[model samples]
Target: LELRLKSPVGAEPAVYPWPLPVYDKHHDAAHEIIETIRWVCEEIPDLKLAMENYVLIDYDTKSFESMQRLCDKYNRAIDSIHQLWKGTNTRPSTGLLRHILQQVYNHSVTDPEKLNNYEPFSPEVYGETSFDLVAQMIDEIKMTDDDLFVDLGSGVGQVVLQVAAATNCKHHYGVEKADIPAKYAETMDREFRKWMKWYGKKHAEYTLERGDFLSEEWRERIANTSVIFVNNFAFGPEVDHQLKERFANMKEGGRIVSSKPFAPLNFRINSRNLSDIGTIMRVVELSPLKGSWTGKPVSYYLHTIDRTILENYFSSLKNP
Candidate 1:
């Protein structure tokens, strides 16, 4: 059977002819027909097969139903994006632009093969914080223009850029260890700067450092940082321990947002102040941070750092 599809835009209609039918109706016959349609769709951009009006000679109702269901699912997904962008009066901010970029990157650059390649890199999981969730956390912290925002293992630098655009933060820093993704982050950085310049807004100065965030110099810089975001979702035991100690020594009144708990309940830390001994980091909020890829949810722990109490407690343990 030869079927002609309505061409896209200005192109001519495309004709697809089925290969001669095979006698084995039970096994390869059905698959070959379905695969043929799939192959044509993938290989030819102008030819599209919609089950709405297409005719199948020997194919079962199940095949048509399955393809229709898949088409409907994708259609709804696209509609959702359209709905989100329907508002016309919303103020233009870097967050919205970053969201657009995130969608583009997820669909175009992300794949099973690339995702699997990232799994072997320890503490280098590729993920981005939801822009809305970042805004919510920043609001909760009451971030002023004076505060500095830093994201450790900040893949693609979306959070850093979003925070800068949304809050008008004066300074932002993102540290990425991976090479390819770091380059991607650099690309986003350039795009963000260009967009900000075009929007007639003062550009927020941000630094995207490529290397180990735990290095002494970086750690020292982070200690003075007001708000820190750590995507420690896939970190190992050793890295977890180091993070606990490093944050335990962070500047007084600093806050941290991590994908996991920084320390166990029984864990102890050494500190100088002994009078106010208790949890080194107090959990201010435990909430779901929106997932990077669309509507997924991930747990996020927000903690306020007060190492003096823990250092005091640990000093007592040593002496007593």
Candidate 2:
């Protein structure tokens, strides 16, 4: 015999503007159950069970059904493990979760099938960075009243949201080439703005724009922005070319925080040459990139370039 609730499982995006309530309810229930079970386990020490090998105690059908119900209640929560708090302020799984999220996000960014359904960069990955990292990074730059924070590949606008929450900057901008991520970033930004009023905090004034970062027109717009953050492996191959050709175009004293640095394209711009340029600008991971996932190679450096070039680009972004 099977019990069927007859209610469709989970929040349907078509029906709900946001699935956040569904996610929150499930998470709260899971935590509440976990806490209650923990207390009961302490009171009833003999009920302990071990992983890999465990013994079962016989219970009546009612008991079994109750336990089954309790466990089944967590199904939605488990399904939303991806919605777990991953802000730069929250303590994330330092081991596998981080690595896997990074790999999965990167794959989804490039892989056509997954990228289509993926919600930009997922709040989960953004949560992993923590408010501390976001705050520290913003404060380090000495954000000003007239400044703008630009997340070059800002997925879902997490960093920008954090910056807006922490600072009083004039504007925060996110640039994305793809429609899906741009849409997520835009929607999240608008929703946060709407909700932040209830919390009695001024929302960060930010905008997410769609366009290729490789164009000179795009570079010109970025020139005057105060901050630019780039998490590499988010863009297609053309980004490497832009960094080389457009470095001089950025505003003086603009800062860029790139998980993967863009190296100098001085050779091509100077030599008037295009042949075998990919070889010269092969973005290799100079550092032994650490990962949070298993059996996946993460790209930390966009192209195979010398550390000196990588260091210089950041220095230019920070001090130019």
**lDDT of candidates 1 onward, in order:** 0.56, 0.46
Provide the lDDT at 134 for model 2: 50
Q: Candidate 2: worst 10 consecutive residues by lDDT?
A: 13-22
- State how far residue 66 of model 2 sits from its true place (Å): 18
Which portions of model 1 miss their true places by more than 4 Å?
1-95, 98-100, 103-129, 199-203, 264-278, 288-297, 311-320
Lowest summed lDDT across 10 adjacent residues in model 1 is found at 5-14
TM-score of 2: 0.48
Top model by lDDT, which number? 1
Instruction: Give the TM-score of each candidate.
Output: 0.56, 0.48
Q: Write the per-residue lDDT of candidate 1 for residues 1-320, one digit (tens) a residue.
A: 44333322223333334442332335233343344344434433333333323433334434545434444432343344345456641224443454334432432343324323444222122234465456556666677777888999877676776666666566899998887668667667765654344323444678877988878887787778889988787889888767766775677778888767665434444443222222666664455443233434545677777765565766787899
The residue-by-residue lDDT of candidate 2 on 151-268, one tens digit each, is 7766656676666666778988777787777765655655554334321234557777877776767777766666666776455577656665554444445556555556543333
RMSD of each: 12.3, 12.5
